[PDB]
Motif scaffolding. Sequence first.
Motif, PDB file in Angstrom:
ATOM      1  N   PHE A   1      -0.045  -1.436  -2.301  1.00  0.00           N
ATOM      2  CA  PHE A   1      -0.604  -0.919  -1.050  1.00  0.00           C
ATOM      3  C   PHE A   1       0.461  -1.133   0.034  1.00  0.00           C
ATOM      4  N   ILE A   2       0.741  -0.080   0.786  1.00  0.00           N
ATOM      5  CA  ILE A   2       1.713  -0.133   1.850  1.00  0.00           C
ATOM      6  C   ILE A   2       1.028  -0.051   3.229  1.00  0.00           C
ATOM      7  N   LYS A   3       1.397  -0.987   4.092  1.00  0.00           N
ATOM      8  CA  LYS A   3       0.877  -1.036   5.447  1.00  0.00           C
ATOM      9  C   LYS A   3       2.106  -0.971   6.389  1.00  0.00           C
ATOM     10  N   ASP A   4       2.123   0.036   7.217  1.00  0.00           N
ATOM     11  CA  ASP A   4       3.188   0.312   8.178  1.00  0.00           C
ATOM     12  C   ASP A   4       2.628   0.523   9.581  1.00  0.00           C
ATOM     13  N   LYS A   5       3.125  -0.274  10.528  1.00  0.00           N
ATOM     14  CA  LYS A   5       2.707  -0.224  11.916  1.00  0.00           C
ATOM     15  C   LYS A   5       2.872   1.107  12.618  1.00  0.00           C
ATOM     16  N   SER A   6       3.819   1.946  12.212  1.00  0.00           N
ATOM     17  CA  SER A   6       4.043   3.246  12.826  1.00  0.00           C
ATOM     18  C   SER A   6       3.266   4.390  12.203  1.00  0.00           C
ATOM     19  N   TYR A   7       2.425   4.140  11.208  1.00  0.00           N
ATOM     20  CA  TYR A   7       1.679   5.269  10.591  1.00  0.00           C
ATOM     21  C   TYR A   7       0.215   4.922  10.513  1.00  0.00           C
ATOM     22  N   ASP A   8      -0.668   5.849  10.879  1.00  0.00           N
ATOM     23  CA  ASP A   8      -2.100   5.614  10.864  1.00  0.00           C
ATOM     24  C   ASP A   8      -2.787   5.887   9.536  1.00  0.00           C
ATOM     25  N   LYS A   9      -2.077   5.909   8.414  1.00  0.00           N
ATOM     26  CA  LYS A   9      -2.674   6.135   7.109  1.00  0.00           C
ATOM     27  C   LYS A   9      -2.159   5.021   6.169  1.00  0.00           C
ATOM     28  N   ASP A  10      -2.990   4.580   5.231  1.00  0.00           N
ATOM     29  CA  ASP A  10      -2.523   3.555   4.288  1.00  0.00           C
ATOM     30  C   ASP A  10      -1.858   4.324   3.123  1.00  0.00           C
ATOM     31  N   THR A  11      -0.869   3.735   2.478  1.00  0.00           N
ATOM     32  CA  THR A  11      -0.236   4.416   1.351  1.00  0.00           C
ATOM     33  C   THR A  11      -0.364   3.485   0.127  1.00  0.00           C
TER      34      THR A  11
END
Length: 298
Positions: free
Chosen positions: A40-50
């Motif tokens: 699971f990827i969590k990135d502060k600049s994107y509003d969707k989880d990957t």
Amino acid sequence: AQHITPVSEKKVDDKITLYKTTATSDSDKLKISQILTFNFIKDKSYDKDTLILKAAGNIYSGYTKPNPKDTISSQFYWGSKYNISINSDSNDSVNVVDYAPKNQNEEFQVQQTVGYSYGGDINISNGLSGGGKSFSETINYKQESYRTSLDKRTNFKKIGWDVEAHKIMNNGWGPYGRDSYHSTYGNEMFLGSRQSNLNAGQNFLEYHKMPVLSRGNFNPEFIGVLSRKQNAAKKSKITVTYQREMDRYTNFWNQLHWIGNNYKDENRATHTSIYEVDWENHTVKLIDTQSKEKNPMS
């Protein structure tokens, strides 16, 4: 058996965090096992989880050795096709955004690296890239004589890969396949020799000369990448299905020469697992597992 490791949290960079969990399930009876890595990827600049989900493990070919005492005619089951599928359900905000392999491939070995980049961009590259800076997951599998092609049901909620017998050589003759035709000798893909003096059960291509995927095991390595808007429902369902399709190869002495034949899809063995994905906690929970086979042995 079934097992799920606790979540492994790793800070990729200053803005992206990795939450990795490995889930496993298998059928001892069918010799099919799933090793799924949920990245699971969590990135502060994107509003969707990957979610970069890797499907690996093992799928026995389902091969059965022919009885060497068989006279007149003999036969055996062999693994003619493998299918690996991943589908998302229970959440219209969860979509398939990428997957690997992406295109048809008949190379003897498939090696690719899927990477995640700041912003939500998913990239692909040939070979086993780095490990690293940025997150990446690799795929590596041997499929000599077989070909990988995308399942025709692949869409926004489902991805599938078919690995089927494609170019099988028999002592320098071929390449043969599941439907090879010859008006006199039939399908000679695994026939021993046209004028062989041995019993029918002994007049087949030597086991070690057959492709590993036809008589041994297939070790799949596939990747499905899914996205989920962060303001949507927190849970979803992931279903992973591993299947082997078996053909019955046969031989027959007609008083003058040998004849070989191949009967497609005589049996199928499948192992399916359903997981409840908690996108907020980056965890997975096994909902259920099913193992089945309709026409074993011979």
